[PDB]
């Protein structure tokens, strides 16, 4: 009689029973000796990590250039149309995002899994809520102040959009803490089908269920923002922000659907890298589909920079 993997013929000792070779030790059939269940984690020389590294490097350089260029033109009405220092509150946070990808490479423990689970997905909610409330401005601020001026004009006068964004941040903190309690920070070990000799180690939300644990309110925010932006696709022309918002939302949606479809089937030891890829890509979406164009308008054409032109366009 034989015994299937995980139970080795105890030829090291009494051979009557196919005792279980403890810990990583493991054998297929009879097979007196025991092997090692080597664990694998995202490595360096692996080409996919280098691809993601370039993707995360060029985009970060782009955001840094846009940061400096915007900062040095505090007077030009383009920089003043972004809402003011609020836009900077956006940009700075995005850097942290790209700065964290090197958390997804290296051996995984609680030290880095805490960041992976709690820090990175904090920003994304706020950074999409900013655009959501931005569309809220573009359309509502005059639509309801012109459709419901009876109270709206004074009701939204004092509770500026900042608090409405703050409540979304609050919900995000609540959900993050609830999930963290619901699960553990324990790193997770799994078995690689390519051969029993290999195994996997990852942070806890690696399961697509725990990954989707957060891609619900964020998707809700993205859809609402896209709706409002499309509402004013071309009828308004504040500084041509509805168009860019629409493009960024479309890219987000395509990335989400692509990842869902691919993970339906599974690809062995690829989920880590595919996940990092989608995260970096959805950051590039914003970093060079919302802020790049305004850098181009500021640094190539003064057709907007002139005070007269923008005092002309604000009214319309």
């Amino acid at each position: 009689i034989d015994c299937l993997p995980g139970t080795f013929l105890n030829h090291t000792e009494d051979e009557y029973e196919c005792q279980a070779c403890p810990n990583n030790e493991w054998s297929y059939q009879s097979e007196t000796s025991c092997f090692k269940r080597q664990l694998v984690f995202l490595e360096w020389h692996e080409a996919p990590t280098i691809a993601v590294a370039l993707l995360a490097a060029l985009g970060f350089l782009s955001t840094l250039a846009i940061l400096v260029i915007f900062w040095r033109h505090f007077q030009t009405p383009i920089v003043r149309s972004a809402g003011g220092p609020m836009c900077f509150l956006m940009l700075t946070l995005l850097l942290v995002a790209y700065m964290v990808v090197p958390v997804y490479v290296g051996p995984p423990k609680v030290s880095t899994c805490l960041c992976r689970q709690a820090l990175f997905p904090l920003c994304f909610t706020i950074c999409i809520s900013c655009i959501a409330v931005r569309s809220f401005q573009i359309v509502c601020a005059f639509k309801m102040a012109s459709r419901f001026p009876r109270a709206y004009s004074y009701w939204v006068r004092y509770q500026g959009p900042y608090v409405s964004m703050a409540f979304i941040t609050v919900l995000k903190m609540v959900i993050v803490v609830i999930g963290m309690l619901a699960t553990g920070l324990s790193p997770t070990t799994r078995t690689d089908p390519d051969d029993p000799k290999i195994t996997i180690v990852s942070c806890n939300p690696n399961y697509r269920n725990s990954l989707l644990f957060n891609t619900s309110l964020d998707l809700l925010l993205s859809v609402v923002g896209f709706s409002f932006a499309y509402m004013g696709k071309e009828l308004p022309t504040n500084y041509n922000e509805a168009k860019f918002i629409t493009l960024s939302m479309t890219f987000y949606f395509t990335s989400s659907v692509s990842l869902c479809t691919f993970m339906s089937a599974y690809s062995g030891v690829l989920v880590t890298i595919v996940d990092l890829l989608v995260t970096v890509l959805n950051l590039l979406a914003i970093s060079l589909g919302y802020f790049g164009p305004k850098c181009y308008m500021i640094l190539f054409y003064p057709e907007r920079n002139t005070p007269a032109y923008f005092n002309s366009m604000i009214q319309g």
Binding site: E234, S264, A265
Partner: protein
Amino acid sequence: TFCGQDEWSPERSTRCFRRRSRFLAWGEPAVLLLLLLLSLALGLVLAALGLFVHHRDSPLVQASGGPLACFGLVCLGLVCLSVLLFPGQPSPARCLAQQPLSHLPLTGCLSTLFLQAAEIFVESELPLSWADRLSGCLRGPWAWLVVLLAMLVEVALCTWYLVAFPPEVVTDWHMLPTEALVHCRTRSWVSFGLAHATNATLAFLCFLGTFLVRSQPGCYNRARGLTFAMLAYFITWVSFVPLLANVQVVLRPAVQMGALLLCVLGILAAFHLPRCYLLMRQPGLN
């Protein structure tokens, strides 16, 4: 001492019975239903082609592209006719000439809708000087040039995936009790995606070029059809994938078959059917 995997002898059996061959034949109910769908597809497509060579000089058709449009329609007919290489007894030529010969025509035709979308975008968004230049350039051979470029890319990719992994026939003796399943096997989604890449790229490009264009005030817009046609292709592939991953082994050949039909039925109802219907009613419209 059990009748060889060629024979699976059920319990309490002193005499073995050979496992019959198992392959999706040409008489199953499913294949008959899908071939009827094929008949409908071919009928509508050929009606379209006749119409498009009927009013060739008309202004409506002239705006659509004409000879590029006819090339597109004939290539769609070709792909629809290429839905009969999947069913039947596994054979080497049919195994090796099933996917590439069903994906080449789609790209060779979709090049054309990409041309239309690019021409719309040239005026809709770009500045005036580049708009004039591109209007004066793309209107000419440039269209046939891009068609040829797509065709060359698709053939190169086909050859690469071919040599890398030519699908082969396989026999499984332990999938169902009393039958040996002979079917053509592939390698995960590698070849699938490699053969899917180009037309997906073109479809996305058309969608992003023509999504935002303001609907023509009080007139039919050339953007609505392209957008609603591209979403059909995207949804079709994204929606069958789970099915093909989660279905009975034998009916697996029978899933790819279906997709190419429904997808085309979408396009011929989003870009060609509306123009054809107008043309039908052109004499009555004026």
